[PDB]
Write a protein that binds this ligand. Structure first.
Ligand SMILES: Clc1ccc(-c2n[nH]c3c2CCCC3)cc1
Length: 342
C-alpha cells in the first residue's frame, strides 16, 4: 500500500505517483496519476466511521455530489474503498484536479474586473442548479470554490448542505450555527436556522465583496461581532426590516444599538464597476425576503456578457438521529457503484 508523508494512502494500482496537496476535514488530500484516463487527479482520504456527525457529513456530501451533474459543481469520478464493510476503515474520493481555490488566489492575486465577472457568473450558475434541486450549500466561501488553469470554477464541500425548509426556518436570538462565521447572513444571529435559499445568496455577496478588494468584507472575530461588522456597513435596519423580525429578543437587540449610517459601496470599493456594486447591494440586502434570488442575479446587467438561461441548467428532480453503524452501512452502499464488480 502506498504511503504519503506519514500514513496509508492506498488508492490501489489505478492511481500512482502521489504528491501531498493539503488536509481536509476527515483526512489527507493528494494529487495522483490516473493510469486509466491518463490525467492527474485529486484524491481525498476520508476517515469518519468513529464519529456519527463526520458520518452524516460524509454521507450527505457523497449522496448530493453523486446525484448532481453540473459544470460548476465538483463531481465524484471514483470512490476507492475495501470490498467489505468489515475491512472498510477509510474512503477515497477521486475528483477532477484543480489548479487552486479562490481563497489561495485572493491571498496574492488582484482580480481584473473580467475575472470577477466570470467567477461570479460561474458561482451563480452552479448555485442556480443547487437551488433548483431544493438544496442549500450553506458554507459558500472562497476555499469552497475550486479553479483550474483556465479559470473554470467548481463549487465543492457539501458537508453542511441541507434540503431547503423555509416553513421551519425560525429560531431564537443567538442560536448556535455551524457554517463559517464571516459568510453568515445577519438573520443567522437573529432568528434564522439557515433553511432558506437567501442564506447562500448572502454568502455569494460576501465572496463578491472579497473578490473586489482581496479582503473579507465582514471579518467578525466571534459570534455577535459578525453582526456588528454587517451593520457597520449596511447601517441600521429600517423600521420595515425590523417589523419583519417578530422575535422580541432579536428585535430589541437591534433597537438597543446606536444609529449607524450606511457606508456607500463606491467609497468601500472605489475602483469597482458600478454594475458590480449595484448587484452586490442586492445580494447584501439585510432583509432576506428582499434579497435577490439566484436567477435574478444571473439576469443582472453586471452579468450581461454571460447570461443565457438556456445554458444555465437545473436539476432533473428535487433532492440526524441515525447511528454511526447504520451510517457506515449507508456509506458502504452509496459507494458500491464504483466497485470493479460492474
Ligand atoms: Cl492547490 C489545490 C487546491 C485544490 C485542489 C483540488 N482539486 N480538486 C479537488 C481539490 C481539493 C479537494 C476537492 C477536490 C488541487 C490543488
Amino acid at each position: 500500500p502506498e504511503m504519503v508523508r506519514g500514513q496509508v494512502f492506498d488508492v490501489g494500482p489505478r492511481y500512482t505517483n502521489l504528491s501531498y496537496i493539503g488536509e481536509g476535514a476527515y483526512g489527507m488530500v493528494c494529487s495522483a496519476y490516473d493510469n486509466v484516463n491518463k490525467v492527474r487527479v485529486a484524491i481525498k482520504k476520508i476517515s469518519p466511521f468513529e464519529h456519527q456527525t463526520y458520518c452524516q457529513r460524509t454521507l450527505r456530501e457523497i449522496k448530493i455530489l453523486l446525484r448532481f451533474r453540473h459544470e460548476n459543481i465538483i463531481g465524484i469520478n471514483d470512490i476507492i474503498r475495501a470490498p467489505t464493510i468489515e475491512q472498510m476503515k477509510d474512503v477515497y474520493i477521486v475528483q477532477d484536479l484543480m489548479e487552486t481555490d479562490l481563497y489561495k488566489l485572493l491571498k496574492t492575486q488582484h482580480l481584473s474586473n473580467d475575472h470577477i465577472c466570470y467567477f461570479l457568473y460561474q458561482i451563480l450558475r452552479g448555485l442556480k442548479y443547487i437551488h433548483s434541486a431544493n438544496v442549500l450549500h450553506r458554507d459558500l466561501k472562497p476555499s469552497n470554490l475550486l479553479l483550474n488553469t483556465t479559470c473554470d470554477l467548481k463549487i465543492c464541500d457539501f458537508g453542511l448542505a441541507r434540503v431547503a425548509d423555509p416553513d421551519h426556518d425560525h429560531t431564537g436570538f443567538l442560536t448556535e450555527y455551524v457554517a463559517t462565521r464571516w459568510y453568515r447572513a445577519p438573520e443567522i444571529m437573529l432568528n434564522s436556522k439557515g433553511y432558506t435559499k437567501s442564506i447562500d445568496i448572502w454568502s455569494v455577496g460576501c465572496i463578491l465583496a472579497e473578490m473586489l478588494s482581496n479582503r473579507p468584507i465582514f471579518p467578525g472575530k466571534h459570534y455577535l461581532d459578525q453582526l456588528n461588522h454587517i451593520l457597520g456597513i449596511l447601517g441600521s435596519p429600517s423600521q420595515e426590516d425590523l417589523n419583519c423580525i417578530i422575535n422580541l429578543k432579536a428585535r430589541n437587540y437591534l433597537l438597543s444599538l446606536p444609529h449607524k449610517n450606511k457606508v456607500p459601496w463606491n467609497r468601500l470599493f472605489p475602483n469597482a464597476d458600478s454594475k458590480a456594486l449595484d448587484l452586490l447591494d442586492k445580494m447584501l440586502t439585510f432583509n432576506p425576503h428582499k434579497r435577490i434570488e439566484v436567477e435574478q442575479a444571473l439576469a443582472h446587467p453586471y452579468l450581461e456578457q454571460y447570461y443565457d438561461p438556456s445554458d444555465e441548467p437545473i436539476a432533473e428532480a428535487p433532492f440526524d438521529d441515525l447511528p454511526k453503524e447504520k451510517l457506515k452501512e449507508l456509506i458502504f452502499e452509496e459507494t458500491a457503484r464504483f466497485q470493479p464488480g460492474y
